[PDB]
Ligand binder design. Structure first.
Ligand SMILES: Nc1ncnc2c1ncn2[C@@H]1O[C@H](COP(=O)(O)O)[C@@H](O)[C@H]1O
Ligand SMILES: Nc1ncnc2c1ncn2[C@@H]1O[C@H](COP(=O)(O)O)[C@@H](O)[C@H]1O
Ligand SMILES: [K+]
Ligand SMILES: [K+]
Ligand SMILES: [Mn+2]
Ligand SMILES: [Mn+2]
Ligand SMILES: [Mn+2]
Ligand SMILES: [Mn+2]
Lengths: 272, 272
């Protein structure tokens, strides 16, 4: 058997900070421009469940500006739902590209967001939900609420994928993290509230944001992320949302064996 | 002399329709997937003026979702201004990526838009103009009005670039086209008003949208674009905003010698 079966499969679609690596002006920072692993798209995760016959349920976490190229390069040509962490540009400005799937599926695309995120999507992308005055474009999205500490499930051809959302502090706003089975996704986080600890401890894989070496008001530094990894004892940790000071080979050396920097297209399967 | 001097230089950053080619679901339509010229980013044009010493003024027309990769691949690492045609997703959803230049230039990025476009950018990207409640992010953009039949000039290190905007019908809304010297850029157009004809006739290069073979309410078909090219007698025409029915090699054969389909990265210099 040479295709995925009886598993969850995770693909790190993007592992960069908000301006990407390099920045738009060609700035690679301290990254080796010759290592393709240092070319970073904006942060996003693809989550799939495969059954015994290889049928799949497919869910994306965040639709940033790189969403179209991320999906094309993933090789996965269908989508059941999108789930959002928070309403920052690098996580939402690719939303229009969900249109194609609406035509393929013959129904509105199910999207999942908390109230803060939803209310900002309605402000800035209202035409995706309701046809405005002077337009003939039908809406393309169907909104579902999510909230910390309330699990939700997304159905599809591979069976249901159950998400456990939890609260994160992200500078001056809240973002969501998610546990999916044994795998935890924590991007855009500067502190973990006490009530969220149960969701983040004892993960088989912890995917955790580490922006740079120096402190930043909205994200963990590398040292802060490593302190959390030591406390939470994941079997493996993968760093994400990495900015131009963090070079792949350098960070690989500086971190424990069970910890690695992410790279775009990083893919693994786990039991379900 | 092996770098540009004493010229205008134009780069077709993107030549695709709104979902790109291929679509996000991997659909190439009738395009040969093996020809790299058929991989199309969303429509945008880079305009540069170089002086005798190779100093440049750099202006982008539209900042769609592909804007960051377009600029990186262009090799041009600075920007003086952005000019907008109309407020559709494929032309504006990359706007946040102007942030990097604001830091480099030490001043807000000058953006140019008509009232319709400006009012939609304020709705959907207000935080780029004014810090909202609960935020510490400074604004990044400085807005300037443009209107059909009123020329405007953008200053920079290579000298001024003079734009002549004009009205286009684009289905149920108006879009702007621009003449820059001898070069005319007409994307997202389904009809030309009589008063715009003076700007589009007798171009050295006419860059004109041709979506597909079949009629569409918002864009010229290939046949309609060719009818206009015959009436307007440009020396050379380049087709843009091309959707998945239009294969590069096929359209090259079907069109007169002085007419060609565009491709991403297409670049030419003209006298100033
Ligand atoms: N009010 C806002 N709405 C959406 N995006 C914002 C807002 N304010 C700032 N941003 C952008 O959100 C991103 C913040 O990046 P991060 O450091 O990854 O939390 C940057 O792309 C900012 O330019
Ligand atoms: N009210 C709106 N604001 C912004 N973009 C829109 C709106 N309505 C539709 N669109 C998108 O704008 C694009 C229209 O594409 P075009 O066929 O190139 O004119 C598509 O990406 C649409 O999903
Ligand atoms: K390591
Ligand atoms: K031809
Ligand atoms: Mn972010
Ligand atoms: Mn953020
Ligand atoms: Mn368009
Ligand atoms: Mn349009």
């Amino acid at each position: 058997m040479t295709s995925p079966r009886n598993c969850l499969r995770f693909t790190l679609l993007g592992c960069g900070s908000s301006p990407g690596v390099p920045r738009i002006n060609g700035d690679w920072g301290k990254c080796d421009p010759k290592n393709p692993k240092n070319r970073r798209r904006r942060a996003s995760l693809l989550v799939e469940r495969y059954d015994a016959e290889g049928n799949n349920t497919v869910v994306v976490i965040d639709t940033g500006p790189d969403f179209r190229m991320q999906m094309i390069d993933s090789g996965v040509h269908m989508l059941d739902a999108a789930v959002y962490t928070h309403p920052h540009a690098d996580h939402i400005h690719g939303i229009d590209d969900l249109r194609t799937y609406v035509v393929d599926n013959g129904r509105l695309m199910d999207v999942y967001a908390n109230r803060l995120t939803r209310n900002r999507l309605y402000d800035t992308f209202g035409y995706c939900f309701e046809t405005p005055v002077g337009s003939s474009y039908p809406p393309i999205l169907s909104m579902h609420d999510i909230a910390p500490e309330t699990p939700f499930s997304i159905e599809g051809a591979g069976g249901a994928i159950r998400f456990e959302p939890f609260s994160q502090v992200h500078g001056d706003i809240e973002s969501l993290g998610f546990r999916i089975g044994s795998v935890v996704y924590c991007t855009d986080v500067s502190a973990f509230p006490e009530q969220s600890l149960q969701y983040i401890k004892d993960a088989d894989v912890l995917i955790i944001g580490a922006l740079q070496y120096r402190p930043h008001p909205s994200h963990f530094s590398l040292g802060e992320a490593l302190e959390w990894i030591e406390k939470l004892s994941p079997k493996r940790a993968i760093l994400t949302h990495m900015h131009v000071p963090l070079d792949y080979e350098t960070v690989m050396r500086e971190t424990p064996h069970h910890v690695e920097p992410g790279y775009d297209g990083l893919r693994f399967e786990v039991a379900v």
